[PDB]
Structure 1
Amino acid sequence: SQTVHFQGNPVTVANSIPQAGSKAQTFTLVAKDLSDVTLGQFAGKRKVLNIFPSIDTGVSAASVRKFNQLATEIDNTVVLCISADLPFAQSRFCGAEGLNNVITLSTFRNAEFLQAYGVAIADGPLKGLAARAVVVIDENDNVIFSQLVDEITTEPDYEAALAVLKA
């Protein structure tokens, strides 16, 4: 298992975040219209997965705002904002701020994504929520970057996520 921190206090996260050079595991998540979305639906594109505990807490919103803007600066990529929030909470946020580039996806019917992607908080009050994480996937569904954010109350390293998409 893995360990992240909340203001220094350890939090247990199941399994292992995918490693660069490994195959991305397929998933099914739920979109704003309650349709089911799979990894294969993005065939041929790069994918940025911005994973977080809740849009309604902490730095998660800040990260959505940032990735929404960054989405405009890269080509042939989808930016997926993924959490255990119901689709309605995710879309409430994006709608209030007019954040139209990111695609919001919910794990509320698909807890197995959190296990497969090594982001399931396993124990404690945050149990059932995703840890803060970024995974970047290439056009051939190979993982080319991941970060399991060590301090959950800090934003992910946007630069590092974007660097693997540059020439």
Structure 2
Amino acid sequence: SQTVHFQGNPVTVANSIPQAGSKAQTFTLVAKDLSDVTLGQFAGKRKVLNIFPSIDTGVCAASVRKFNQLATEIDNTVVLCISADLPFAQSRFCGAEGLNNVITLSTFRNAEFLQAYGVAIADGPLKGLAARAVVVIDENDNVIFSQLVDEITTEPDYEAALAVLKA
């Protein structure tokens, strides 16, 4: 298990986020029309897993869409914005609005994803939600960047994620 912070308060997160070098575990998640989406449907693309406690917070942080946009301007890249929000709530997400190759996916019937990817919050009020995390997977499903964000309300190292994506 890992420790992150919320309102600078400590939060346990299950297991261990995948490390660069490792093979990405397969998953199934749910798209905005309630269809099932698997990692294998993105075979040969680079994938960013952009993992949030919620994407239904009612505030549209500029940094979210900025990263999503920069990431998908790199050829052969998809960004998967993942959270425990139901598809009904993700359908109006502002960070995917107006951007191709940015897809929202929900964990509501696939809780094993959050365990497998080391991002399941295990205690406190946010128990059951995902931690803030970014995971970059290459064309052959190898992890090439991961970060479990130390303060859930602050930005990931987008600059570092984008550098891996290009390089």
Q: TM-score range by the shorter chain?
A: over 0.9
Q: Please report the TM-score for the alignment, with normalisation by the length of structure 1.
A: 0.92
The structural deviation recorded for 1:100 is 4.3
2:91 match: secondary structure: helix
The range that moved more, 55-64 or 29-38, is 55-64
Describe the shift of the 1:165–1:93 C-alpha distance in structure 2 as closer, same or farther (beyond 3 A).
Answer: closer
CA contact (8 A) 2:68 2:96 kept: no
Aligned mates of 2:96, 2:162 — CA distance in 1: 26
The range that moved more, 90-99 or 10-19, is 90-99
Aligned mates of 1:63, 1:95 — CA distance in 2: 9
Q: Please report the TM-score for the alignment, with normalisation by the length of structure 2.
A: 0.92
Q: Give the unaligned 5+ runs of structure 1.
A: none
Describe the shift of the 1:2–1:18 C-alpha distance in structure 2 as closer, same or farther (beyond 3 A).
Answer: same
Match of 2:8 in 1: 8
2:93 match: secondary structure: helix
The range that moved more, 45-54 or 95-104, is 95-104
The structural deviation recorded for 1:70 is 1.3
1:63 match: secondary structure: helix
1:66 match: secondary structure: helix
CA contact (8 A) 1:78 1:102 kept: yes
Q: Which runs of 4+ in 1 moved over 6 A?
A: none
The structural deviation recorded for 1:87 is 1.0
Alignment of 1:81-96 (within 5 A): 81-94=81-94
Describe the shift of the 1:70–1:52 C-alpha distance in structure 2 as closer, same or farther (beyond 3 A).
Answer: same
Describe the shift of the 1:115–1:134 C-alpha distance in structure 2 as closer, same or farther (beyond 3 A).
Answer: same
The structural deviation recorded for 1:59 is 7.4
The structural deviation recorded for 1:91 is 1.3
Aligned mates of 1:60, 1:47 — CA distance in 2: 23
1:154 match: secondary structure: coil
The structural deviation recorded for 1:33 is 1.0
Paired residues in the alignment total 167
Cα RMSD (Å): 2.0
Q: Give the unaligned 5+ runs of structure 2.
A: none
The structural deviation recorded for 1:15 is 0.2
CA contact (8 A) 2:49 2:136 kept: yes
CA contact (8 A) 1:20 1:146 kept: yes
Aligned mates of 1:83, 1:93 — CA distance in 2: 11
The structural deviation recorded for 1:95 is 9.1
Aligned residues with identical type, % of pairs: 99
Aligned mates of 2:62, 2:95 — CA distance in 1: 15
Aligned mates of 2:96, 2:73 — CA distance in 1: 22
